[PDB]
Amino acid sequence: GSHMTHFLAFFLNEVEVQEGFLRFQEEVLAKCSMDHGVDSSIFQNPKKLHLTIGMLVLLSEEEIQQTCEMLQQCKEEFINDISGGKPLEVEMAGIEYMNDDPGMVDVLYAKVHMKDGSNRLQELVDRVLERFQASGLIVKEWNSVKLHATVMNTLFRKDPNAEGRYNLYTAEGKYIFKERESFDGRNILKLFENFYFGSLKLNSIHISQRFTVDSFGNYASCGQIDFS
């Protein structure tokens, strides 16, 4: 099938980055609230800030442990060379949208780039996807994995537990065509194009699910590997 059960992601919810995000939210809501469709319900939950690298379809208890066993293989084959036994110092700075009309934005993202300006982060998630394409546990991704994190999504107005294409209108088998609503981001982009949310040290790839949360709303890991 193609009903994403779990996904692989970096958890990006350090207290520093959350506060930069909260700072970002209130300034946007102060200087851009009159803009169309712009309110707080479309903002991300600061405790769920993350960078998704892959969608998985896991069906058995064994397939989970297989994924964990399979992430460890990534650690030995290539992640150790890229990481060098030390984390990846990265920055969450700048915003971007993927469509062509900044007046009709459906999703807004915060860019994630290596602090040392290198390319190591991209090759990490790219090689990880390869190692999983051989297993038939990953959903086919047409585009490339973009190194960014969601910060605004109009779907959060209707479904705060949405994960991109996996939401209340697409769950499982009943694909429903509700035309997505948009917001005007022309002012947000002119004021906050290069907003600095914060820096963090990426050290873990987690298996998570849209509803597998802890008592505060964070994502709960279903298994992970560590770079150091």
Superfamily of domain 6-226: Cyclic phosphodiesterase (3.90.1140.10)
Tokens 């060379």 correspond to 81
Q: Does residue 36 contact residue 30 with C-beta atoms inside 8 Å?
A: no
Residue 141, CA distances (Å) to 34, 55, 145, 155, 187 in order: 37, 8, 8, 21, 32
Nearest Cα to Cα of residue 206 among 44, 68, 49 = 68
What are the φ/ψ torsions at residue 36 (nearest 5 degrees)? Answer: -60, 140
Q: 20: which 2 tokens? A: 């930069």
Domain boundaries, the chain: 6-226
Please write down the HEC assignment for all residues of the chain: CCCCCEEEEEECCCHHHHHHHHHHHHHHHHHCCCCCCCCHHHECCHHHCEEEEEEECCCCHHHHHHHHHHHHHHHHHHHHHHHCCCCEEEEEEEEECCCCCCCCECEEEEEEEECCCCCHHHHHHHHHHHHHHCCCCECCCCCCCCCEEEEEEHHHHCCCCCECCECCCCCCCCCCCCCCCCECCHHHHHHHCCCEEEEEEECEEEEECCCCECCCCCECCCCEEECC
For the beta sheet containing 204-208, the strands, ordered from the edge strand earlier in sequence to the opposite edge, are 50-56, 6-11, 204-208, 224-226
Q: Nearest CA to 202 among 79, 36, 64, 71? A: 79
Technique used by the depositors: X-ray
CB 125 within 8 Å of CB 88: no
Contact status, residue 164 vs residue 173, Cβ threshold 8 Å: no
Q: Are 118 and 77 in contact (CB under 8 A)?
A: no
